[PDB]
């Protein structure tokens, strides 16, 4: 569990990899984006001691 | 080579196509065909076999060479991602055996430094262009010349070129 995780990332070799030009797309690569809604509930509690 | 008729400074030079390296002749492999058959040996210049070989100098590192060559001559970084094929076909005579071996050809680029009209520094880049095969018909146990197999120094199978451009500061 050492404080070192990106040691195996070699910037030089990565920078030498050419960009992806001829893309062979996969047709159904995404889902319908479903937004998440949230109703915030409020409690009302009484007290005599502050 | 020494004392060119050029002004002082740095130059990018194209030496032409058809350069084969020393001791690298038969490292690709060979084919033995016989008795009227036809052998076809070829390759596809893509990815790792298209990576150029660099030979830098203290003044001319890898980036200097690559950028200057690509600014003046053909951009080999873009062009080596597109696969390009080549092939050679040879037919064996009847009742005889023929051997054929393949070796890549290279574009030879140079970065030279001229000081008082005499070359004092030269760095060399080999860019893998295409291939070249050599063939010979052989008898069982026949001796073969040492020149057919082995190459001592880097040489150009075609006429050498010298296309120079002065690198501007
Ligand atoms: Mg170009």
UniProtKB/Swiss-Prot annotation, chain A:
It comes from the Bacteria. The 133-Lys-|-Lys-134 bond is cleaved during long-term storage; the cleavage site is masked in the M-PTC complex. Has 3 domains that are structurally very similar to those in BoNT/A; light chain (nLC, equivalent to the light chain, residues 1-408), N-heavy chain (nHN, residues 409-829) and C-heavy chain (nHC, residues 830-1193). Belongs to the botulism non-toxic nonhemagglutinin family. Assembles with botulinum neurotoxin type A (BoNT/A) and protects it against pH-mediated inactivation or protease activity at pH 2.6 (the pH of the animal gastrointestinal tract) but not at pH 6.0. Necessary for neurotoxicity. Forms a highly interlocked heterodimer with botulinum neurotoxin type A at pH 6.0 but not at pH 7.5, called the minimally functional progenitor toxin complex (M-PTC) (BoNT/A, botA). This is Non-toxic nonhemagglutinin type A. The lineage of its organism: Bacteria, Bacillati, Bacillota, Clostridia, Eubacteriales. The chain holds residues 449 to 498 of 1193 of the full protein.
């Amino acid at each position: 569990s050492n404080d070192s995780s990106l040691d195996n990332v070699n910037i030089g070799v990565i920078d030498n990899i050419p960009e992806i030009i001829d893309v062979n797309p996969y047709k159904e690569n995404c889902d319908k984006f479903s937004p998440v809604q949230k109703i915030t509930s409020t409690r009302e509690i009484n007290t005599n001691i502050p | 080579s020494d004392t060119i008729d050029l002004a002082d400074g740095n130059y990018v030079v194209r030496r032409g196509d058809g350069w084969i390296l020393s001791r690298q002749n038969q490292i690709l492999g060979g084919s033995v065909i016989s008795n009227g058959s036809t052998g076809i040996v070829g390759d596809l210049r893509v990815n790792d076999n298209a990576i150029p070989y660099y030979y830098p100098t203290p003044s001319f590192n890898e980036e200097y060479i690559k950028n200057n060559i690509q600014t003046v001559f053909t951009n080999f970084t873009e062009a080596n991602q597109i696969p390009i094929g080549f092939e050679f076909s040879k037919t064996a005579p009847s009742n005889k055996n023929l051997y054929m071996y393949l070796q890549y050809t290279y574009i030879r680029y140079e970065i030279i430094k001229v000081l008082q009209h005499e070359i004092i520094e030269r760095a060399v880049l080999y860019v893998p262009s295409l291939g070249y095969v050599k063939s010979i018909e052989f008898n069982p146990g026949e001796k073969i010349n040492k020149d057919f197999y082995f190459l001592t120094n880097d040489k150009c199978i075609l006429n050498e070129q010298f296309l120079y451009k002065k690198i501007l500061e």
